[PDB]
């Protein structure tokens, strides 16, 4: 599995994120948009804990998330490298 380390993509102070970048884990089908809706880009990943194993693609993203925003750290996708 993809073991996320502190030196994954140590360019700037980049936050590692692990998510499935083949398409996206939507979930139970409902009233969803066929096109990702955001002012920038809808990135749905979680921060890669160093030493933790994420069975998904790990990327590095620099952005400012609000804690009261979503039930997870949604990425603004402002500065993302994959």
UniProtKB/Swiss-Prot annotation:
Keywords: Cell wall biogenesis/degradation, Conidiation, Disulfide bond, Secreted, Signal, Sporulation
Domain of life of the source: Eukaryota
Subcellular localization: Secreted; Spore wall
Species whose genome carries this gene: Neurospora crassa (strain ATCC 24698 / 74-OR23-1A / CBS 708.71 / DSM 1257 / FGSC 987)
Effect seen on changing residue 73 to G: Impairs self-assembly and rodlet formation
GO annotation, biological process: cell wall organization
Record's function text: Aerial growth, conidiation, and dispersal of filamentous fungi in the environment rely upon a capability of their secreting small amphipathic proteins called hydrophobins (HPBs) with low sequence identity. Class I can self-assemble into an outermost layer of rodlet bundles on aerial cell surfaces, conferring cellular hydrophobicity that supports fungal growth, development and dispersal; whereas class II form highly ordered films at water-air interfaces through intermolecular interactions but contribute nothing to the rodlet structure.
Domains: entry comment: the Cys3-Cys4 loop (residies Cys-19 to Cys-45) does not have an integral role in the formation or structure of the rodlets and that the major determinant of the unique properties of these proteins is the amphipathic core structure.
GO terms under cellular component: extracellular region; fungal-type cell wall
Impact noted for substituting residue 47 to G: Increases self-assembly and rodlet formation
Entry keyword annotation includes Cell membrane: no
UniProt-reported outcome of changing residue 49 to G: Increases self-assembly and rodlet formation
GO molecular function: structural constituent of cell wall
Descriptive protein name: Class I hydrophobin eas
Subunit structure: Self-assembles to form functional amyloid fibrils called rodlets. Self-assembly into fibrillar rodlets occurs spontaneously at hydrophobic:hydrophilic interfaces and the rodlets further associate laterally to form amphipathic monolayers.
Family: Belongs to the fungal hydrophobin family.
Induction of expression: Expression is controlled by blue light and by a circadian clock. A positive activating clock element (ACE) is found to reside in a 45-bp region, just upstream from the TATA box. Expression is regulated both developmentally and by light and is abundant in illuminated mycelia and conidiophores but is not detectable or is barely detectable in dark-grown mycelia, mature macroconidia, microconidia, and ascospores.
Annotated disulfide bonds: 9-60, 18-54, 19-45, 61-80
């Amino acid at each position: 599995a993809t073991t996320i380390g502190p030196n994954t993509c140590s360019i700037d102070d980049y936050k590692p994120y692990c998510c499935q970048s083949m398409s996206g884990p939507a979930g139970s089908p409902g009233l969803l948009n066929l096109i990702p809706v955001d002012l920038s880009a809808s990135l749905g990943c979680v921060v890669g804990v160093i030493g933790s194993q994420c069975g998904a693609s790990v990327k590095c993203c620099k952005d400012d998330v609000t804690n009261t925003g979503n039930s997870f750290l949604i990425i603004n996708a402002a500065n993302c490298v994959a």
